[model samples]
Target: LLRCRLPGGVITTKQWQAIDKFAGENTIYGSIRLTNRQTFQFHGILPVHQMLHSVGLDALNDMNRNVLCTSNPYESQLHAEAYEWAKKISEHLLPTYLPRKFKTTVVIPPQNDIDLHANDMNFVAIAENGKLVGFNLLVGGGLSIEHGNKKTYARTASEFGYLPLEHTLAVAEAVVTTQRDWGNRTDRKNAKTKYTLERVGVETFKAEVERRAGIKFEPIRPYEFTGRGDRIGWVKGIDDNWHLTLFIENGRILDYPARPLKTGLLEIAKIHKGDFRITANQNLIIAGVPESEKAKIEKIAKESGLMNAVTPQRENSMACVSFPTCPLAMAEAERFLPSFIDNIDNLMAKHGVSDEHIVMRVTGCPNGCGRAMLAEVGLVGKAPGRYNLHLGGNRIGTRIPRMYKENITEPEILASLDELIGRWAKEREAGEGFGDFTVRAGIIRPVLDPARDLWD
Candidate 1:
């Protein structure tokens, strides 16, 4: 397992070319998997990990992993700023020790594509009147709950107040050091920042962070995440450049017999003068293209069949790279979700709700790498062909889903959703989301307080 950490998921065309070359030469399947944290993973590799550094894929250890941020092209300046800070923060916290792995992300709303609430820490870029302000710092959110362990829960990041841009590094270091000082180390499962925050209390944690950083945090700035999910297809950026977001199902960049995605992208990179943005949702954005190059790029995409028709269900869906690659996987995820989603599309169509963009995700186990707990429709594998179905999360990616069924087969899962979606079509209030309707109709209860009620 080789992971190349790409901060902010930004990779240049040349870098992408090197990866494509490396995968073809080094891996058995010649494929790459995009992780939820906006990095690349290469499975089935050997002959020295140092072979990666030659391709500019050096490794980092005992520090924050790849930092996530919004991948939207429309907010070009904000995205750029957030990405730069992510790099700075990663550098500031480099070569550090902690009780367990820590994750961080930066996001600018109206787009929650980064899954802001799923990180151990996050910076929500707060803007006012079309200008940049500081960030609303949040901490302690994570999703790696052990099955049957009530003490372990999937909790969203709690607000830690606001900080100006200059103090981001200071606050970041303070948070990490505080966790290092207070986090539980006896039990690895209870050693994340979330557990530390739970034991120390948010207020005390905030005070310690302020004392260590020597900066007082302002009251949290008013902000809102209108929705999540990437804007697929082409859209114009702030600088009049175009960005085309293409769906890479499960973030796998490989050449199928028909599509030949890797081959097509390599060809595009050879000529196009644009960078590529890998999204946290396991998609790619061909960014910074001028209007003159749009026609040629579109031609390549069309010829390669890269722009295939996608349903709302598939577009809003993602799964973790499970099965063949993940030793911890109990069942299939990346390989099976596409066909499962096809079945779900049929079910939704039968219910006349085919147009609905229900956020769905699947993970091979309870480790929550795929972030299925935050999906409107979530499936966690329990056995080879059975899963636990969860529901009630919203499109905004702020809420957690509740397990609605335990150890159900694929057909049983389909039948249950068919009935729920059919009823939802008829009984839902005007503009009520599928997740909200599920909770309102008492089909599944909302996880009011994940710290305490997640397993309820």
Candidate 2:
């Protein structure tokens, strides 16, 4: 598999056409897989590897990987500015090699669409008077952990204080170079920036970053993330340009006889005058679309079944591309989550809570590439046909969930959620989400203090 990392997940219509052409001609599966990090993964592309260069696509390495930002820049000028910084930081750090892969994201608060706390480094854009001023720097967030390794745990990013816009690139470099030098070279498992922060302490790391960048950080700016995930359907951006967010199931772009995602997108790319924005949740946004062309785009989308009827739970759910492609996968995820969600949706309907949204995620393994640990209902693959069930994480992407069951099959998994969904429907308080209800009812303990209780 070859990952085509797009910084800030922004690609032009021309670029999309080129990639689709490449996938159809060069790849064995002829599919494009979207990832949680806002990138594309093409399977079986080794034969015509050089062809990728023609399309301005590069393969992944132990460098700062794809930079993530809020999916739709038309949300605000601050969001657009933040996206520019994402591109700047990605380009600034493109040449630096690290001990292990590094991840970064830029977010504007109150949306948290970029999964703010799941990245290795992040810039939370701060706005005052509807203009961009600076960002709150965060570091050391990662979710990958080996099963049974108590030393390894999923921890959210720690605040490294605020920095003005001028210091963004410098501090970004400082963070990466510091981690590149101090990271554990012997053990790849411990080499991510998360463990480095754990070993050196946030204070020490903060001081080192300041010294390297020649700028001291200020106290953190006040921010709040009220929600996470994408804004589906049509949304009018501040620019008055219409943006449409489409749910690409499991982030796979292919042609089915009924739902031709690839063919539909290809058809739109031919006529679209705007760009495409990929959300961190594996959705796509036809961005910067004018009002005149909205009808044309909608016609294609509906005809191709891209706008097919889907449940709120399925729309909010995500899964990583596991099995057949991922070498480390222990079970199926992308291939299995759709049918699993079908059952889950039925369960919700039975409980009379079909409209309620649950942030569900599944991963092929404990590596947490799909960010299963942060989802309200998380499933980590344990075996070929079994998974470990976890619950009680909220939608805002702040808490780590606790495991409820270990190595369970599909029936057992559904059985557990069936009772939980029934209880959530019958007993839940006003506006209480499924995840919040689970915590309030003591179904699972919430990890209030991630530094001390993340492993618990």
Candidate 3:
């Protein structure tokens, strides 16, 4: 469908004009979606696919299949060059047919977007003597879990080997092409590369990759990811440029009555002679603003009624594209997540649990596209207007959340979760997150706040 990108999610002001032109001319709503994958997607059916083809528009969905690294501009310059090279490897390896989709992520540690290990192939940046050098390649991690079926659960990727910057693309090409050749085509449900990893193990998969590329990898080394999500507000780079990060709700950068995020960005894009980067948190960064223009930019943001400082709960909340486009989705995602947060906000204010950040998310289905299963407080849709409350996932996505209540109405979820939060506010350790708090208390769910508990 709709697509656009410039390196590292960086789009120049000229390119911005082109996107604005295309969206205005082609899309029904005259808008573009800022996707979690660090690119803008054009929305609108238009019955325009075939027509565009007729107009000699060669198909361009490869960006759909391209790999991802951290969208955080704060990532190192080596990280940037490594990601571009890795992405070029993926974007160039367009197979005519791939049974299962492949994803590549090159996250430098301490800036994980999600479980990089869960992708088809993962490259965690390694630092030696305080200098970013190569990546620790991880293979076989995935998240293709199905409800009522533990056999197809989400699993993280494991260490394969070390690869220098030059070898990154070799590893990526070997992994993806090998996956296309060996992945299952009979049953889509059983076709993820993770299942193949389960059957064959990590060493075999690495061997396959080695065999494909005819290059033995260096020994695996030590690296760790502490957490995901980006730091909010202004960031200055080595180039003496400035970038502003906004806390976009659910990554939907549309307009609100007073908070005109979409319109505000458009206006900024107009006079701005800088690049833009999309964050994994689904927000925008207008980069390269001169320090002299910094005040002007902030004034525009303030005048447009866009406020970036946010509560930990609100800042960490993530949602996915569900409902209208996704065939597997059970309910709405971006539109409904704000309501849930508002409910949580009202319930939590009584305890003043507003200052600290607690990772939270909402997804429309078990697919976990919105990263619901990785939040301290999570919700996944079970059926239309009914949900499953998931709890205890850590901030870094190192843990998968456990189901607390199943097939419950929206309010039922809110009440039960509210009860747990109220308890957390009263009983939590200093600086404790909801996930660790629940785990420390050995709480799988709020024992006293089940659907029929004191709510009547």
Model 3 Cα shift for residue 228 (angstroms): 1.5
lDDT for each residue of candidate 1 in 1-456, tens digit (9 for 90 to 100): 878767888888878888888899888878877777788888787543565566566666485678887888356767777788887877776675788888988888778888878888899898766666789999988888777788888888899899987888889889989998898868988899888888889999999999999999999988887777778899988766889988888888888888988888889888878788888888888888898899999889877767888897898988888888788998799889989999999988898888887888898999988899899999998889989999999989889998899999999999998898998999999888899999999998899888888886
Q: What's the TM-score of each model vs. the native?
A: 0.97, 0.96, 0.88
Quantify how close model 2 is to the true structure by its C-alpha RMSD in Å: 1.7
Ordered by lDDT, highest first, the candidates read 2, 1, 3
Indicate whether candidate 2 or candidate 3 has the larger TM-score: 2
Worst 10 residues of 2 by lDDT: 46-55
Which of candidates 1 and 2 is the stronger one according to lDDT?
2
For model 3, which pairs clash?
A: 141-157, 312-357
Of models 1 and 3, which has the larger TM-score? 1
lDDT of 2: 0.86
- The candidate that achieves the highest TM-score relative to the unseen native structure: 1
lDDT of 3: 0.69
lDDT of 2 by residue, 117-178 (tens): 77899898888787788999989888887787778888889998999988888898889899
Q: Which digits, one per residue and each the tens of the lDDT, describe model 3 over residues 53-172?
A: 443332342322445666653444555565566557555665446667666676767777735745777778786754557888877656546777756666666678888766766777
